Every structure is written in C-alpha cells, then in structure tokens.
Design a protein around this ligand. Structure first.
Ligand SMILES: COc1ccccc1CN1C[C@H](C(N)=O)CCC1=O
Ligand SMILES: [Zn+2]
Length: 139
C-alpha cells in the first residue's frame, strides 16, 4: 500500500484504488497501473521533474529503504496477476531489488522529489510506475 499526496490529488496504484478513489476520479491509466483521485485536504509531496536514474525506495516487506539505480520509463512485459492479464505496462522503470505484491505503493524518491511508486516485482527485480511526466499534478 501507499499513495502520493500533491495539491488536491491522491496518486495510487490503479489495482489498489478504493471505492472513494473511483467516486472522485480525475484520471486513470490501466496500461500504467495508475489512478489519480481528488482530495479536500491539500497535499505537500514534491514531484521530481528530472531524468534521475538513481534514488531510494521504501520496501514495506523489509521495513527498509533501499538505494537503487533504475531504468528510464519504458514499455515492459508484465506477467499476469489477479488484477491484470499478461500485458505490456508503459512508463515502467526497473531496478535490482526486493519487491512483493504488498510493496505496491512504496515511494521512489531522488534528490528532486517523488519519482514514482512500486508497481511490479519478482525475480529479484522491482518496477516503479513513473509519475514525473504528469506535469498537471502541480497545477
Ligand atoms: C511477484 O509479483 C509482484 C511482486 C511485486 C509487486 C507486484 C507483483 C505483481 N503485481 C503487479 C501487477 C501489475 N502492476 O501489473 C499488479 C498486482 C500484482 O500483484
Ligand atoms: Zn531527480
């Protein structure tokens, strides 16, 4: 679990979105595993606007933060789960690191702010759904 709170927006993994997220829907993309909903309280997370390929992510299955090198956002093949059939997920970044399904939502951050959230894993890899291209999250 985990979300990003910026301005009047809440960003979560689309497969973990609640009934309230869907009832206050702003934008969703199944191919990215992202959903954005509106909030009444004002969020104060900072979104990174950069091309960093190093950062730190929170891994709830280890109660630890790990420094990682990650790839640029891209179309990567993601095996079937109970939430999606096997498909290509877009805007995905991989790193060598630990990730279990319950780790989705953990934030990846660089010196400029929030880069994205955990979305995939397995085989000693961890995938992050990038949010750096969503410039409207700041306006
Ligand atoms: C070993 O599987 C994982 C490990 C870490 C995280 C996620 C998975 C598999 N997964 C990824 C899905 C997706 N994003 O397409 C959403 C739900 C899910 O459970
Ligand atoms: Zn950065």
């Amino acid at each position: 679990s985990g979300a990003i709170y910026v301005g009047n927006y809440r960003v979560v993994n689309r497969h973990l979105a609640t009934h309230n997220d869907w009832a206050n829907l702003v934008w969703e993309d199944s191919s990215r595993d992202l959903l954005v909903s509106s909030t009444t309280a004002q969020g104060c997370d900072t979104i990174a606007r950069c091309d960093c390929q190093t950062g730190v992510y929170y891994c709830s299955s280890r109660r630890k933060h790990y420094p990682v090198s990650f790839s640029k956002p891209s179309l990567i093949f993601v095996e079937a789960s109970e939430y999606y059939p096997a498909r290509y997920q877009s805007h995905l970044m991989l790193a060598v690191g630990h990730s279990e399904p319950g780790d989705c939502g953990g934030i990846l951050r660089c010196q400029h702010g929030v880069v994205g959230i955990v979305s995939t894993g397995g085989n000693g890899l961890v995938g992050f759904a990038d949010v750096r291209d969503l410039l409207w999250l700041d306006e």
